[PDB]
Design a protein around this ligand. Structure first.
Ligand SMILES: *[C@@H]1O[C@H](CO)[C@@H](O)[C@H](O)[C@H]1NC(C)=O
Lengths: 50, 46
């Protein structure tokens, strides 16, 4: 068949939002843990140094 | 919508015992819906 008449598969994704807490959250980067030295740390939103 | 529970045996089934024990959390719900009334579910053979 012609190129314009060739069958194509299409996938569509849609968005909806609510005041309830969000449930679909993609990952974030993370590094390796270090011992016995002064260092800033962030653990699940908890921030500190030591 | 948060749930707390614990389990303990009983040998004085007639009424609630004395003492003190704390409830631990086990599961949470992000549902966000409104709740005003509640009921219970039972089971029986017939
Ligand atoms: C729940 O009740 C509040 C007022 O108590 C109302 O504003 C809200 O629209 C109701 N529904 C939800 C889903 O929060």
């Amino acid at each position: 068949n012609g190129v314009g008449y060739q069958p194509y598969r299409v996938v569509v994704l849609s968005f909806e939002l609510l005041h309830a807490p969000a449930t679909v959250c993609g990952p974030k980067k993370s590094t390796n843990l270090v011992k016995n030295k002064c260092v800033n740390f962030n653990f699940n939103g908890l921030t500190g140094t030591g | 919508f948060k749930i707390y529970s614990k389990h303990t045996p009983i040998n004085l089934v007639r009424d609630l015992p004395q003492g003190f024990s704390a409830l631990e959390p086990l599961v949470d719900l992000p549902i966000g819906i409104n709740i005003t009334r509640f009921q219970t579910l039972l089971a029986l053979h017939r």
